[model samples]
Target: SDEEILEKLRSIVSVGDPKKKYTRFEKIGQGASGTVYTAMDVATGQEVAIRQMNLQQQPKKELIINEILVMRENKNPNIVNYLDSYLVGDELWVVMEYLAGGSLTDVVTETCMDEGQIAAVCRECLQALEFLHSNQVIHRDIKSDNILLGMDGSVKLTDFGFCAQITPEQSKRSTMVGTPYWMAPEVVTRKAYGPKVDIWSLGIMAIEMIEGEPPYLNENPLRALYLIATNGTPELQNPEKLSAIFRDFLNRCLEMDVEKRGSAKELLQHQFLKIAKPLSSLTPLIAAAKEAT
Candidate 1:
């Protein structure tokens, strides 16, 4: 059935071939349903990161297909642009715009993260969210590891897992998906959830960039989900060391009342973003991660 649909897509949409277009060198990430590679684009004469998704791994068949479609249409400065999609060996390859700066997780682990830079990442991340939210696409997966950077000091989001393009008639989802550590309470509870789920994740991620690990790093992942489902609002680990405005921003994002959580558009206007460092400031940390790698 996967191949049947694959062939159908192949015919209706102009599918590409990696053999002719891209020269592969190495892999970037492997997320079960897919593998990633750094390929040299023959046409552009430049490097691009291509994520190879397995067609046979289809649960919601559209999960893989929609990934290809959205990224191909996602022409935002804060996102990894999809260059092309190729059907190669029962695998669909999605070539993304190159970013040598590597994952933000590496930058965080290798060196310190300044609050200004933290806000810089937060600011750009929300911009990406604003665009997606406006279109009713919920990028259910939001974590620091998914946050990729460019050597030019560009901040972009990547590693999309299950981005939901909710039609006006479809309403919301009550699925329990996304990284356990970063998952929202409503998601863990398997209750009706919406786009603000991403904000809760970003709020958790905001703290990760602040301290080291996320909220419940030691507990079992399933238990972590339980805690998120039942625990009080997430709180800081250490001395609550952060700027007054940054603290306020986090509280707003972590608000237990799902309806009260700040929208991406609203969060973008927060004073915290105003105090953020420029996008270029991330260059030093990116360089450090490259060196450490």
Candidate 2:
């Protein structure tokens, strides 16, 4: 059994030829579900980010397969690529392309983002969402943390931890899941909602990226949720400071009524995201993550 466990770990995601190229490094991140590590590809000698899924409640085989399939299906530049999936020491491993740019939230901390940069980021994410929605997938979780920036000056959508596939006809949900500040009124109210919830969350993220906080932040999270669910959304007041076009785009996302909210496809055409040139192309960048044994 011990040997089998070790075998499982080792088999997680093929490392290719160790003699030719393969070097395990340090761990970079970890949560209840899994741990992440930085490894070097021996053949090309490129660095890689490896996520070892938690074993307590191993993910459904179909879920894992779906994740890989959906990620790889659309080879768009803005979406994170799923390189492979395998086993390691009884733990499941998901090999995803490494993104070094960090999150849009991280970028907005020091200073306000320029309208052009904001539009660039918005458009990039819109395109990715468009692709996902077009394929009948809903990114239930659309927050700044899940939206990553790459070192090569591009944005990539990563982490399908809470994504789901829902048809337009199947609306609203009672599961009541999502980040608080970014949750739409319908979601917070625990009403059946649809893909439009994502638009509201995206709207909150856009404002948050511009101001370093969600539009509904209060001293207490519960109070904030109540306000968000019961009251009107706060205005972007200085829409002039921000790009009116971009702010207008966010306004559409913040619509309390899911039906009134714009679709991902519709959002793609918003003036804010309809820039001359799309966001930058994807780039392969490498950074070290602390190794896990």
Candidate 3:
């Protein structure tokens, strides 16, 4: 039955010769789960990103399943598009849309953005979070590197390796996963957390946009984790560079108590977000970043 299902899916997805269909370019990204490479699809002459992971080595088979399932269901504009997936020996190949603008991390490092540009990124990320939470999914990882940009200024969320799906009966998750810099207090404390955790990471992302890096960037990973759990709240490095509304918005997201934290939908209505620029305005920044590289 599994083979038959794969056959049907291939028929619908236009199965190509995996060995001859694409030629790998440079290694563009890497993560605990796998390596990502930019490639050119010989069949369609389109550029794509492919992730290759050794399935037999890791005991994270469930996470792989969840990533595929979520990618299959989510077709939002702000989320990365999944083109195809297949098994090549013990390795799993996942093909995705190639974003020429690269990750937000690169953009932040290469160019300086004003409040409007940061707000634009926040708006897009919040919209994507709204979609994920409404669908009972929590993107356990939220950071600059996980956010990608297109040449046309489109912001897309990627790297679903840490994503978790909340079943209807259970709305919270207790897994200690995600990057250290953006980890929520609840997550670091190993307490049950829900979508609000993502909101907290968004606050950290806000700080990262204002400053070059997230709070405690210089500290050890374990120390940062401890500080995030023990400290009352993390503040922006230079509050004067940002507006009062923006600072207040970060406060709402970085609320220590999960109950006090604002949902993605609630934050979307904040005054800071009210000043968000159009997505098309980000095109220039992305173009400049690409040119510099």
Candidate 4:
């Protein structure tokens, strides 16, 4: 009881009012859910990302709860850290660790990632996915845009807007969610799917890294869905450019049969991931991208 009391005392003294605790800076980005801003924690003087979404206009408040629950349940280096969350007026404010290197999509746009960089990214994501899956949570959305990097080369998965927790009785989810380009066949077809769906999206993300764009990027949304549902398996346009192990990794993720797809735990052991550089190796890539942009 003494330790518990001390812990409570420490937290009480450490955490403060969100309004007084943070000083909002320039706007980061605006999306359907909310607008993000880079903010400073006045107490610690640490930069953090704050997402403020008006819950009053949204019919589904459960989505916010889902995001909070998923973030709270998992604590790992590969996942974005949820520092604090509270409400101010009708807005739900989520405070997260600020990743200055920007989204993986931004980096991909500024420069192409080589196999090693790609492996490092995938290894980080797979670690995150593995943790989430073991905790009965499915990220649902796994794309370059949702993956972010810090200046120190810290890679994190963010934007749990579409994330869902798998129940003990019903481990599979049937929600048709996620971006069109990265959506797995089972998800696109509205079939009961689980963590494997996220793996499929990871495959698509790898393609995005390799090609600068996902397959069927120019196709209509409906058409893309049709192709994903019917097409056997998606392939890289120019497979020769990539190493065999890299292509094999993609094959494991893009397996049509969800049952046959490699789990995050399993994929982590794949040969492609064996050569991944440390997260620190990504700093130069991020720095270069920032300089170019």
Candidate 5:
């Protein structure tokens, strides 16, 4: 099935551009591992967001296959569509739907949104997590930067470099990894953690979405890590600032005890999601048939 779908995708590329002849039109983003560019797919005469790995630290076959594996398995409204993967010599490339609205980090940095908008974003993130957990995958790194919003208000869960298939054993990730500010207490302590780590990151994301910055952006990284690890968090005094239901949902996500944290399926039943509209109910489909194009 995967081969069939991928083969259909390969047919979309034009004859002349089969060898990666297109050039970068704009630099969209840069991360630790790669630089993302808005590229023209000459074969189909369409624009695509192409992630290119640096030549010096080029993406090995294993890493590329790992990300491709995750993308092939995901097909949900809240997850970005993985179009195809191509390579030219040592350069690695992945084609994905170009979200015009850009990342949540950009939205928060460029403009301010009311509580309602923030809650909408959170609901999308929850739905995406539901799909991931249902498939037994763990997104070890979840942050606002990895959440992309489409032009039509569809939220997409992007970036799977840190994601992995969850194992039954708890001590899988004893390494202090992921963005420090969003790391759960157990993750930061280099102890056994589970799917709840994503929930903790989501809690941090919710706070940042509402406040426009992480709750604790103190002087030292170690201090911030200690604050989270010690179970000391700033209290949210006013529930009226945000939806009471949203705050309750945030409380469940921020629960320190891994076992006590709400599962993705349980979170879907929360009042915040119940009041929000389904992502599939958007007025127009995101990008108006990105697949057909």
Candidate 6:
């Protein structure tokens, strides 16, 4: 009760107006709960990504609050950094580190990701996951769309609307959430699962990195659920062409048994990680994606 009271008190005094300190610029992106803009901090002249959402009489406001709070608690190079948050008039404004390279989805859709690029992305995402998992956070949503890249080849995770905070007493979660194409088999079957669900999504994302589309992409959401439930681990369109190390890494991630699927820490030790090129290798792909527009 004391802690709760303190938190409430903090909320009352924590927020202020954002526009007074930052100049909002052009639109960068949009999500389910807010619109993102490139902003300049007038005090420091540092560029940041600012998301603004109207919370007046809206249920989505709750989701935005949870996402913002969770992000505010965590920090990693592979994760988007939350700068500050303020309540402005009827909207909540969230400030974050700006990534000029756009989303991994942009790179995937606009350009090709070879095995090297895929390996690099996988390593960075795995590191991000390791950090989150270590902190008892599960990023329920881990599609390419949620992975953003910087022009300097930095990779970071964002969009935490479905992210979950787990406790030691209740480690397994059963709530069904996440995109259809990236949903793990246990999630589709409505089984109680743990953070390993994220590993499964990472496996699917690895497939998307090369194939440019996830399995069951053409199927309806309902049908995709059925397929993911009945099928074992999904495979690449041309698995034979990929290296054994990469294939083994995918197998570990896509393991049907949650326990068998390695944790983020364990997965990081896989040989596939050695194949990951320097972060700079991603710059060309990001540049191509940006210039293609």
State which candidate has the highest lDDT. 6
Q: Is candidate 4 or candidate 5 better by lDDT?
A: 4
Candidate 4 global TM-score: 0.90
Score residue 171 of candidate 3 by CA lDDT. Answer: 83
Candidate 3 lDDT by residue in tens digits, 1-293: 44543444444342444556787566877877688889988889889998877765646565666677788898788999988876654567788888889888878878888888899999999999999999888998999999999988899999887898898788888888888889998886766889998998888987877777988889999899999888858966577877888888888999998888999889889889888888788888888878887
Give the total clashing residue pairs for model 1: 0
Clashes of each: 0, 24, 0, 0, 1, 0
Off by over 4 Å in 2: 1-21, 57-69, 72-75, 168-172, 275-293
On TM-score, who's better, 2 or 5?
2
| Every model: Cα RMSD to truth | 2.1, 5.5, 3.4, 5.6, 6.8, 2.9
> What is the alpha-carbon lDDT for the whole of candidate 4?
0.84
Query: Which structure among the candidates has the greatest TM-score?
Result: 6
Two-way lDDT contest, 1 vs 5, winner: 1
- What does candidate 2's lDDT look like per residue over 60-176, in tens digits? 444554566667666678787777666544466666677766666666554455566667777788888888777777777788778777666678887776677766576445555
**All candidates' TM-scores?**
0.92, 0.80, 0.88, 0.90, 0.80, 0.93
lDDT of 6 at 253: 94
lDDT, model 4, position 204: 91
- Candidate order by TM-score, decreasing, is 6, 1, 4, 3, 2, 5
* Candidate 4 residue-wise lDDT, 205-251, digit = tens: 99988998889989998898889888858967899998989989999
Worst 10 residues of 5 by lDDT: 283-292
lDDT of 5 by residue, 1-293 (tens): 43443354344332333236455568877986688888776777666787776444643435456677788778788888887766444455677777776677776655555555666777888889989887877787899889877777788898787787765654366655578788888876656777778888888888876777776765487787888778644456465787778878888988866778888888878777666555443323333333222
Give all candidates' CA lDDT scores.
0.83, 0.68, 0.83, 0.84, 0.71, 0.84
188 in model 6: Cα distance from truth in Å?
2.4
Residues forming the 10-long window of minimal summed lDDT in candidate 3: 5-14
Compared with the true structure, model 5 gives a TM-score of 0.80
